[PDB]
């Protein structure tokens, strides 16, 4: 599923992501924009053989099981395929664990490089929320 911007903002809010660990909704929408272009089926293979999955490009090295990342963990206790669903529940639940892990949203390198410090409220501007 390719979400629209306000559609994703609304789904993130339903699922309790807004202001989660102090990150406003525009931070999450911005991170999703640059991680996946709002596509729940986005995947990206990393040099180390791990893979990033879904709207927030959650990585198999730590967070989900894909059976093809030696030595990895599955801290969200889900198959990485669950992260590609139309329904963003698994991605949100896992993102809450990631953002709680110590470095906040810096865990998402695209957020650090493209969202951090910018006018992230633009991402929710005009949305009926
Ligand atoms: Cl915001
Ligand atoms: Cl992989
Ligand atoms: Cl994701
Ligand atoms: Cl497996
Ligand atoms: Cl594995
Ligand atoms: Cl599994
Ligand atoms: Cl959803
Ligand atoms: Cl933080
Ligand atoms: Cl950018
Ligand atoms: Na894994």
């Amino acid at each position: 599923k390719v979400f629209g911007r306000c559609e994703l903002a609304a789904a993130m809010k339903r699922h309790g992501l807004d202001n989660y660990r102090g990150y406003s909704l525009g931070n999450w929408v911005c991170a999703a924009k640059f991680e996946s272009n709002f596509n729940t089926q986005a995947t990206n293979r990393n040099t180390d053989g791990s893979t990033d999955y879904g709207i927030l490009q959650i990585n198999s090295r730590w967070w989900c099981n894909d059976g093809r990342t030696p030595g990895s963990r599955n801290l969200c206790n889900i198959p990485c395929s669950a992260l590609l669903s139309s329904d963003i529940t698994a991605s949100v639940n896992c993102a809450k664990k990631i953002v709680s892990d110590g470095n906040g949203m810096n865990a998402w390198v695209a957020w650090r490089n493209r969202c951090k410090g910018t006018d992230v409220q633009a991402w929710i501007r005009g949305c009926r929320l």
Side-chain angles (χ1 to χ4, degrees):
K1 178 179 168 163
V2 177
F3 277 80
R5 179 174 62 81
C6 293
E7 181 185 23
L8 186 58
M12 285 176 161
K13 185 169 177 183
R14 180 153 99 77
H15 291 85
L17 207 50
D18 58 313
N19 307 311
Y20 189 92
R21 285 267 170 155
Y23 288 92
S24 65
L25 196 46
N27 280 284
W28 295 102
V29 175
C30 185
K33 169 74 184 172
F34 295 123
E35 289 296 354
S36 67
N37 207 17
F38 302 147
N39 188 348
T40 65
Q41 303 192 82
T43 59
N44 174 73
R45 176 58 46 75
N46 299 314
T47 305
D48 72 356
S50 66
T51 302
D52 295 338
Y53 294 88
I55 197 135
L56 285 171
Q57 289 291 275
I58 292 174
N59 183 264
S60 66
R61 159 84 184 75
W62 294 106
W63 307 106
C64 63
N65 176 57
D66 63 11
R68 53 149 290 130
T69 313
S72 75
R73 301 300 297 279
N74 176 9
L75 299 175
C76 290
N77 313 118
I78 50 175
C80 296
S81 63
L83 294 175
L84 299 188
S85 182
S86 286
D87 181 302
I88 69 172
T89 302
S91 285
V92 170
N93 288 347
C94 192
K96 288 177 176 177
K97 291 185 171 79
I98 298 169
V99 76
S100 299
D101 195 58
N103 299 317
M105 292 195 68
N106 298 291
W108 289 274
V109 174
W111 175 86
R112 181 171 53 80
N113 291 326
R114 306 182 68 175
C115 300
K116 187 177 187 184
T118 74
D119 181 15
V120 294
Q121 190 281 330
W123 293 102
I124 62 179
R125 187 159 308 150
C127 305
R128 193 179 185 85
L129 291 158

